[PDB]
Design a protein around this nucleic acid. Sequence first.
DNA 1: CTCTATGTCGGGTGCGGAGAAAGAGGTAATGAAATGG
DNA 2: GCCATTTCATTACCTCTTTCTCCGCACCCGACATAGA
Length: 448
Amino acid sequence: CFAKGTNVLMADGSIECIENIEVGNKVMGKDGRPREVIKLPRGRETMYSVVQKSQHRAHKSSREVPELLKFTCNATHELVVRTPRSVRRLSRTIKGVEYFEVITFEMGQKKAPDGRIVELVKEVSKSYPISEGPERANELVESYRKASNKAYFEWTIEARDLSLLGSHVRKATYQTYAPILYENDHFFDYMQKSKFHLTIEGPKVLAYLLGLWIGDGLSDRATFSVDSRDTSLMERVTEYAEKLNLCAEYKDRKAKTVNLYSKVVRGNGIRNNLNTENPLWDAIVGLGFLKDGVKNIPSFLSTDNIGTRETFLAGLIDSDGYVTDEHGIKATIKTIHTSVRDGLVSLARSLGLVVSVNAEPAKVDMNGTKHKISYAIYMSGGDVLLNVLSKCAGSKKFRPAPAAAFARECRGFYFELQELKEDDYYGITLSDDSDHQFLLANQVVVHN
DNA sequence: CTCTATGTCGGGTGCGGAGAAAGAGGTAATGAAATGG
DNA sequence: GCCATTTCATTACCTCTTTCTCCGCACCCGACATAGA
């Protein structure tokens, strides 16, 4: 059961407030498929607060508080958790004799003060004196390592039982969120829904261009900047631009500025068109990449076609995107516009990538200039991210496409738990044969 | 003549990148107190 | 209670990311003029 306010992800990918979800509607299953609701358990109880942990620190100005994943449930809500399997060996001495130890995480049981019989994870140790010889020990260690396939346990525990966990286990316990595997085709239907009728590279190229525009584009013309130096990118531009059937008006004249002109009438002389008869623009406005005068990453994109979701970032990254590879594939977009920040994060995750932003306060300096609140949104995620990069043109950005059928597994997150005051709670119940867990809106995986 | 799309101009500031710090969980290593026979 | 493990939170580091931050000038954006319409 959830505290009132908590937003849910509906199977159609919309977002509905928990208190308003009725019976018969279909929530989002971690598999992207629908999870029907059959009961609206309501009531009053003691509520608990959740909130991811993180290397974040700047406080204690109103420097915005992070976008940390969070939610609030009653004391008996089941937390879909995970805990690593761990086995360490150790040699210690007491009462004279020194022995061998075999510390391990194994799921046992423990008595809740309230009397209940709770199934959880416990730290277990088995030991005998060094006299016998490290042989017995070394045996179990593998007889464990070689016990189960998954490197972690996947169980459930009620907020109110969490304390029951020992120190070591507690710390080594996290919750997870899953990627938005569902898929609308709003992008596609839109494309088909218009006058212009292009090839089957549209959704792709168009997507890629919208990506670049957002990053290095101009906010009042279907034109944008480029690094006179990245040639590969340069071509991509022409190519994709050409496929949408438009022109690349390259002008590096004292970095490079281009303009994507329609092949329409030119006007009387040469004073070509760029915004007119241009799908790019027809969309920027159509799909909402330009809300109320400022750029923006439209939310519908978080729930649309993955390919397209990918390609778009591809574009964003090819302009305003710095990539490295030294200790893992990672990419960093920098912005100053909230909408851009947000919209991007919500999208970034939809894929399964790990995201974290870092604001930089306004400033004013020696040049006496007034800087602005800046955001350095950070991403990573092995394959998932790679498969995006594989769709890049930039030299320093491009990266080969993952093996294949790379799994879009859930990402876990360490959190904090807080005891709140009793309060009305709303919960929903799914049909039996399902997994009994649905995804929230901030992509966090929860049980009903 | 008025109302929009295209070039195009000048000023103040977005962001580019990298290196480093500051957290966060994992490990041993302890000190001892609880369990079962 | 003697024995012989176990259980457990805390301690001092230990590894690994991911949050921060630094700063000037080439470039981004608002401002303006002018071919269309």
